[PDB]
């Protein structure tokens, strides 16, 4: 909540206030009312899989499972996980390849410069989500217009979509939830709408911010760019390392104590806010001796997608988009470079998810 804990003056450093708090320990009391800040890798994994911590902000919209606990969460989670099938994953991977290639085709057709956010980083994830939800070609413009806005207009869209899927089932996930998931009870229109919007909202800004902040960082770290571009077989490690290092979720992952409890030696009253700082945890020097950006590091676990029963439902889609997107940009925009000085690129401090507002780039 205090801005000291939110603001990141630069993608390369942990916010000084956080560094300060983490010196008092990996689960540390701070003041909002005391809340606790988790900055240790092993302790963050503990809290995120400890059942004494809730995702319900208040207890201590139907189908909005991100703020539910088991067993209500489990119902929805099982249904969505059920519908992330190998067929769906395979078809979405191909669609993602086509999406990223189309946006790069458009950028090359248009000139030798572009704002990467406008032309690539927002379009790619919104189109991905179109394909996931079953939005028809002729409705993407409208979906993109709305998506920018940032219910009830958007809520009206998903209602229409839902009604269309009940009448006319396709292979999308909303169709799957209606017709194929053996749901019982059957999902209401309201639940389907909130699920659809949850997927949009969880996957849009996050994926966009990884795509733009990642290119921003690589543009400033020529040895790292050259590694991604020149060794395409290590795209999977590169993406893990970008996920860990950029830590776009900000100011972190929130939980709320269900009851008075003791954790890592702290005495936390029921209701208290506990926040896992993704960027601090992902640079825990007790776990990564050298936590600097290194795209040659073999893949190991991080917290960028969280952990436990709520860990990112979309993480495989997100990975496929980042793997396909970063590789497509670096392969196809020759000598890609910033078109302004790096210090002039505006970062998103005054918003939740960290990233960039705009990213002017050029190529030959
Ligand atoms: C780089 C991109 C992304 C990042 C960093 C990200 C990160 C996260 C994190 C940290 C959580 C856990 C929140 C918590 O524990 O409270 C989360 C949950 C979630 N993510 Fe993502 N995510 C991304 C992309 C996506 C995509 C593309 C979708 C599309 C389906 C998506 C859907 C979700 C949903 C539905 C949840 C809630 C899961 C539940 O509560 O069971 N995410 N994500």
Author numbering: 19 to 50, 54 to 81, 102 to 191, 205 to 418
From the paper:
Recently, comparative analysis of the rifamycin biosynthetic gene clusters of A. mediterranei S699 (an R-B producer) and U32 (an R-SV producer), together with corresponding genetic complementation testing, strongly suggested that the cytochrome P450 enzyme Rif16 is involved in the conversion of R-SV to R-B16. Indeed, we found that R-L was significantly converted into R-B by Rif16 in the presence of seFdx, seFdR, and NADPH (trace xiii, xiv); the structure of the product was confirmed by the identical retention time of the product and the R-B authentic standard, co-elution with R-B in a co-injection experiment (trace xv), and the consistently observed m/z value of 754.3069 ([M-H]¯, calc.754.3069). These results clearly establish that Rif16 is the long-sought R-B synthase of rifamycin biosynthesis. In both of the structures, there was only one typical cytochrome P450 fold existing in an asymmetric unit.
In the absence of substrate, Rif16 adopts an open conformation characterized by retraction of the F and G helices, loss of order in the B′ helix, and missing electron density for the B′C and FG loops. A water molecule that is 2.5 Å away from the heme-iron forms the sixth axial ligand of Fe3+. The BB’ loop-B’ helix-B’C loop region, which is known to be important for substrate specificity determination, is significantly longer than those of many P450 enzymes that recognize smaller substrates. The missing electron density of this region in both structures suggests the great structural flexibility.
